[PDB]
Amino acid sequence: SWIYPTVILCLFGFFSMMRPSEPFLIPYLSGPDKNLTSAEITNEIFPVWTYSYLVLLLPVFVLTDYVRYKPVIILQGISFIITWLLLLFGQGVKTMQVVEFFYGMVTAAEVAYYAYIYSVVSPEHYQRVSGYCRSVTLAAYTAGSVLAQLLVSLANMSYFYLNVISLASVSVAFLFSLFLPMPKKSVFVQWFQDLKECYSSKRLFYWSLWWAFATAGFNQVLNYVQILWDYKAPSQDSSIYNGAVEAIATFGGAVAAFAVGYVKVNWDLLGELALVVFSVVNAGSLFLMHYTANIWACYAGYLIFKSSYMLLITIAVFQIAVNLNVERYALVFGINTFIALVIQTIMTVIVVDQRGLNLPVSIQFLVYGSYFAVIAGIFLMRSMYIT
Numbered sequence: 197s198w199i200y201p202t203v204i205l206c207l208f209g210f211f212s213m214m215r216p217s218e219p220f221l222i223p224y225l226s227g228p229d230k231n232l233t234s235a236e237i238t239n240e241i242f243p244v245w246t247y248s249y250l251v252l253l254l255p256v257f258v259l260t261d262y263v264r265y266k267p268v269i270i271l272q273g274i275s276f277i278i279t280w281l282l283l284l285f286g287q288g289v290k291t292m293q294v295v296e297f298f299y300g301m302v303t304a305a306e307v308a309y310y311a312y313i314y315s316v317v318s319p320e321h322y323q324r325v326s327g328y329c330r331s332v333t334l335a336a337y338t339a340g341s342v343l344a345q346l347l348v349s350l351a352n353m354s355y356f357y358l359n360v361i362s363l364a365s366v367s368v369a370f371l372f373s374l375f376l377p378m379p380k381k382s383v384f385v386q387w388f389q390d391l392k393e394c395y396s397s398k399r400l401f402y403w404s405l406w407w408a409f410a411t412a413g414f415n416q417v418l419n420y421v422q423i424l425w426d427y428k429a430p431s432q433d434s435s436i437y438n439g440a441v442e443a444i445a446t447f448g449g450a451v452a453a454f455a456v457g458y459v460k461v462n463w464d465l466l467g468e469l470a471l472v473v474f475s476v477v478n479a480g481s482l483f484l485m486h487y488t489a490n491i492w493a494c495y496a497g498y499l500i501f502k503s504s505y506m507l508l509i510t511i512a513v514f515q516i517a518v519n520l521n522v523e524r525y526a527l528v529f530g531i532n533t534f535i536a537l538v539i540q541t542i543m544t545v546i547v548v549d550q551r552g553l554n555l556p557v558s559i560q561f562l563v564y565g566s567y568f569a570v571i572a573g574i575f576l577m578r579s580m581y582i583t
């Protein structure tokens with residue numbers, strides 16, 4: 197019953213996220229293969245990704261539910277092929293901006309990937325499926341990560357062929373997405389009112405509020421944890437270690453996601469308790485990374501933070517899916533992701549941008565830990581009052 201769509205979507209999300217070039221993305225397109233400058237790379241190529249992500253998330257939650265979640269997934273499969281074909285056979289800054297654009301399309305449609313499996317299975321499985329889905333994606337990343345390192349350490353395989361393997365992987369994901377079962381059929385202000393009825397759930401305007409604010413800080417930590425590690429321990433082994441300490445971290449997240457799916461625990465009443473415990477765990481882990489001048493303890497702190505976040509976000513997605521009581525699975529996921537990315541953009545503007553605070557990475561993770569400490573504090577105080 198639920199097994200067939202779940203296996204196909206897990207295969208799609210595995211082969212679509214098994215990307216060996218993701219770690220060595222910067223070495224690929226800043227070395228002899230492309231000679232993109234580091235000045236033109238993070239100031240002209242990468243910033244296009246956030247804008248494309250925003251302006252393509254705008255249709256994705258408006259129109260994903262109407263199209264029954266498969267054409268957007270298929271659009272991700274095609275955009276995966278186009279993105280890595282353009283990376284693989286593209287030259288110049290203008291081309292990589294288009295690459296970024298298609299990557300933003302890829303992620304805005306990965307939102308639909310997350311919603312689709314809820315669109316096809318009964319709510320009784322919504323827990324299990326949830327973990328499995330997230331797990332496979334994380335697992336895929338870890339696989340790709342380690343595979344990349346292996347292909348750089350035992351085969352001396354260039355970044356070009358890593359991108360070739362990435363294209364081969366995401367092309368198989370397109371074939372798996374072609375086999376996904378089609379879900380069965382279900383002015384401006386009116387639409388807004390519908391949104392009000394969609395978010396009306398007490399435990400879904402709360403879980404969504406956690407989703408909106410937690411993943412922004414999580415993305416920020418993902419982006420600048422490499423910089424934090426480089427600052428804490430300057431060494432010549434960052435290429436084989438840093439990404440390697442984020443390969444197992446992701447693996448931990450995977451297990452954490454697989455923790456939600458496998459075990460049969462009533463999350464409806466442990467949801468608040470688990471939310472507050474793992475949010476204060478995220479805060480303590482982020483403070484652990486900043487305060488200790490030892491990269492071995494900071495690695496464990498990052499692993500704990502990533503695992504607890506992945507478990508919490510799996511719980512959040514599951515609880516939003518079951519308590520939604522409307523078909524708008526991608527509308528809530530899409531709007532949550534869009535608001536989270538808006539918060540991430542605003543806060544990365546204030547804290548790390550030159551025109552803002554321009555805080556170094558020494559205080560950046562103190563700020564991130566304070567921010568998460570604030571999310572944990574709001575949920576902790578709200579839960580304490582209710583009781």
Ligand SMILES: CN(C)C(=N)NC(=N)N
Binds near residue numbers: 221295296299
């Ligand atoms: C160019 N590609 C494929 C990216 N992953 N880009 C990115 N902004 N990380």
